[PDB]
């Protein structure tokens, strides 16, 4: 990334007139913050440190993910930006992992400092007869499009670090320790350390004295044509066993297998794997009932995916997600809504509660109740029949204890949508096309039903 490293150095040299009073209203860069983004382990932090030191700045690093007290940190950042350090050298602030700050405190403080400096500069330019930012700020993220950074981006100079720099650093350490290491062995050490700089330096020191579950899932669908299938199988078995998280690996395999290319005859391969997956579910249920002796067999089920679906065609890494946690939380929320409706029926309908099972309520009663509420009353020309149906629907809303709430969360005084509480809609409406049609019809019906409920009150 030499071009990127020269751009960073060029941006830090634009601070030189303001900080060092050297000749290349304060001639500062238009963008006062440098924002570095890119993959982990490529040296973002190391490049920020080296270029800041090379430019004559003292480097102060803050991890933004660990500092869960922006309002307090505030004092640290204000001292580091505006107070003279005892060091002869001006401070450069390096903020690492700024995308990890779940609490916008750190970013709000930086935005407040930038806005205060813009107000102070405009007063110096236009003010007829306020702490100015005299120090550079470097911020490092993994993700540029993180919601927290949206307010900071306009003040930032954005620099992408793409995927050598570790090899150059390790060579410089070898040369300073008088170690004659062949460049091949340093590459093999980098590959062993997976780009961990700390692990690399420790392994080098030891020489001188003398698998993410996702990566395993993608490896389970890959066959190398140049290695024995048995050696690959034992290597994968050892990696699955060392990880101890066989369940997450299998859930990964389950989400990936439909998208994987596998020579297909009749999609039987999937039928054989449903029986294993069922075997895993029985084994996982038995782990809570019996002392975990059965845990040794849990590593075998992921390896059936390597045997059945492993192909040379699968060269690209498929990214994955956790639909199950979202489905479990949604199933919990829907079960809680249904449990609340069942309690409401028990309090009002003395007999209905005896005939209503949870399943019959979800599949039979609630879909019909919603179809009755969503029915187009605008097609009914007979006012008497419209009034009678509306009186029966008000009686049904009362039997199920369904409250019409005016959600006034619109915010702009136009059409506060009426919503049913509890929201039966989230339990019954499975089809996204039907959701939009039903919402438009319901809005006119619910206003008529609310007016009738108010008339009855």
């Amino acid at each position: 990334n030499e071009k990127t490293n020269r751009r960073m150095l060029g941006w830090l040299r634009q601070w030189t007139p303001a900080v060092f009073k050297e000749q290349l209203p304060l001639k500062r860069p238009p963008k006062k913050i440098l924002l570095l983004h890119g993959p982990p382990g490529i040296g973002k932090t190391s490049v920020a440190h080296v270029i800041a030191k090379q430019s004559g700045f003292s480097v102060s690093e803050i991890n933004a993910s660990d500092e869960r007290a922006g309002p307090m940190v505030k004092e640290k950042i204000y001292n580091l930006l505006f107070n003279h350090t005892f060091d002869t050298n001006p401070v450069c602030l390096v903020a690492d992992e700024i995308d990890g700050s779940i609490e916008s405190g750190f970013i709000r403080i930086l935005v407040d400092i930038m806005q205060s400096d813009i107000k102070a500069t405009n007063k110096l330019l236009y003010g007829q007869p306020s702490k100015l930012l005299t120090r550079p700020i470097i911020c490092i993220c993994n993700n540029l499009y993180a919601p927290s950074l949206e307010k900071l981006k306009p003040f930032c100079e954005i620099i992408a670090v793409k995927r050598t720099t570790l090899l150059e650093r390790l060579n410089l350490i070898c040369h300073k320790e008088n170690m004659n290491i062949p460049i091949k062995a340093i590459n093999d050490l980098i590959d062993l350390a997976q780009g961990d700089v700390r692990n690399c330096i420790n392994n080098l020191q030891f020489l001188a004295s003398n698998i993410s579950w996702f990566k395993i899932v993608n490896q389970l669908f890959r066959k190398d044509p140049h290695r024995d299938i048995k050696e690959q199988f034992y290597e994968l078995l050892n990696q699955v066993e060392l990880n101890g998280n066989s369940d997450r690996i299998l859930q990964g395999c389950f989400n990936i297998f439909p998208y994987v290319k596998y020579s297909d005859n009749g999609i039987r391969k999937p039928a054989n794997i449903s029986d294993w997956l069922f075997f895993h579910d029985l084994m996982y249920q038995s782990m809570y009932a019996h002392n975990g002796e059965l845990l040794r067999y849990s590593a075998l089920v992921p390896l059936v995916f390597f045997q059945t679906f492993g192909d040379i065609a699968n060269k690209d890494d498929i990214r994955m997600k956790n639909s199950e946690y979202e489905q479990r939380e949604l199933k919990r929320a829907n079960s809680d809504i249904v449990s609340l409706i069942m309690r409401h029926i028990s309090v009002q309908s003395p007999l209905m509660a005896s005939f209503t099972d949870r399943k019959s309520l979800i599949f039979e009663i609630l879909p019909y109740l919603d179809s009755m509420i969503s029915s187009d009353f605008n097609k009914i020309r007979n006012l008497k029949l419209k009034q009678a149906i509306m009186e029966e629907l008000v009686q049904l809303l009362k039997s199920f204890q369904l409250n019409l709430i005016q959600n006034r969360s619109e915010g702009f005084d136009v059409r506060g949508g009426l919503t049913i509480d509890p929201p039966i809609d989230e339990v019954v409406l499975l089809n996204p096309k039907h959701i939009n049609e039903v919402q438009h019809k319901r809005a006119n019906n619910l206003s008529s039903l609310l007016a009738k409920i108010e008339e009855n009150r």
Binding site: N378, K379, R381, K433, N436, E437
Partner: protein, 43 residues
């Protein structure tokens, strides 16, 4: 490429709602003596 069928249904529904309002207006107009006169054919 995923909504071309849901716009046609709403326009037929709106045209049917407008015809139903026009029928109610024809009923009210006739109550108030405004029967819909159609003139004789003249060639």
């Amino acid at each position: 490429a995923g909504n071309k069928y849901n716009t046609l249904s709403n326009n037929y529904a709106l045209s049917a709602q407008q015809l139903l309002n026009a029928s109610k207006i024809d009923d009210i107009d006739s109550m108030m003596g405004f029967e819909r006169y159609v003139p004789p054919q003249y060639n």
